[PDB]
């Protein structure tokens, strides 16, 4: 069922990217980044497992594929979103790119390190499935992070040079976000109470 899972995930990702970015070429570029990251993680995990560095299960492989795809997509979204924010603010492509890197390089790296280290806690378990799921997930996440932090900026550098490719399409504010932020700032108490009550529902 792994292969069908992969196909369905790719279709869903493509549809969601088309819905969000409202363009086709940007979606293609993000999909290219996703493919690169996923292929890198899958290749390194398979290569290491083949030479008996560690054992593998179905769960480990499925988690590797899905998490690698999701992480690559999220990192691409973060980079392109910050770049587009800077570009729409008024900066030219060079300054917008440098601002994007300055404001998102540390965040992406920290998120990737958190995800990688989190799965490494499985290596200290007892049951063989959990213990075997630790290392491959961490290695795949590290490969994905490296690919996102190097190729991402590089592809953004090359693509933005040619034509009006990564420029924003929907030049609009966020009135809903303005309203939500104002509500949160003015009356934190009621909103916090509502959030806490909503979260406690899951204990039933």
């Amino acid at each position: 069922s792994m292969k069908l899972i992969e196909g369905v995930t790719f279709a869903v990702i493509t549809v969601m990217l088309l819905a969000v970015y409202r363009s086709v070429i940007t979606t293609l570029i993000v999909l290219a980044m996703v493919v690169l990251g996923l292929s890198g993680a899958r290749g390194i995990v398979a290569f290491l497992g083949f030479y008996n560095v560690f054992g593998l299960t179905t769960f480990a492989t499925n988690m590797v594929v899905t998490l690698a795809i999701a992480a690559a997509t999220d990192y691409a979204i973060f980079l392109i979103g910050r770049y587009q924010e800077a570009r729409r603010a008024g900066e030219d492509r060079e300054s917008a790119y440098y601002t994007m890197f300055h404001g998102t390089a540390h965040v992406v790296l920290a998120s990737g390190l958190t995800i990688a280290g989190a799965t490494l806690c499985l290596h200290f378990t007892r049951l063989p499935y959990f213990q075997t799921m630790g290392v491959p997930l961490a290695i795949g996440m590290l490969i994905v992070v490296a690919a996102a932090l190097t190729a991402g900026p590089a592809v953004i550098s090359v693509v933005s040079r040619f034509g009006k490719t990564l420029e924003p399409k929907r030049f609009s504010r966020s009135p809903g976000w303005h309203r939500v932020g104002t509500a949160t700032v003015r009356w934190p108490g009621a909103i916090l109470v509502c959030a806490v009550v909503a979260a406690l529902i899951g204990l039933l």
């Binding site: 890198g40 290749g43 890197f101 300055h102 190097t150 190729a151 590089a154």
Partner: peptide
């Protein structure tokens, strides 16, 4: 006063992309 790392990424983008492609292709083909 451009930072060194993003400038390096921006300058040699094509070699980096090709290196990543080659490495991934080798790992997924061998």
């Amino acid at each position: 006063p451009r930072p060194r790392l993003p400038w390096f990424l921006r300058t040699f983008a094509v070699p980096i992309i090709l290196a990543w492609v080659a490495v991934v292709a080798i790992l997924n083909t061998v």
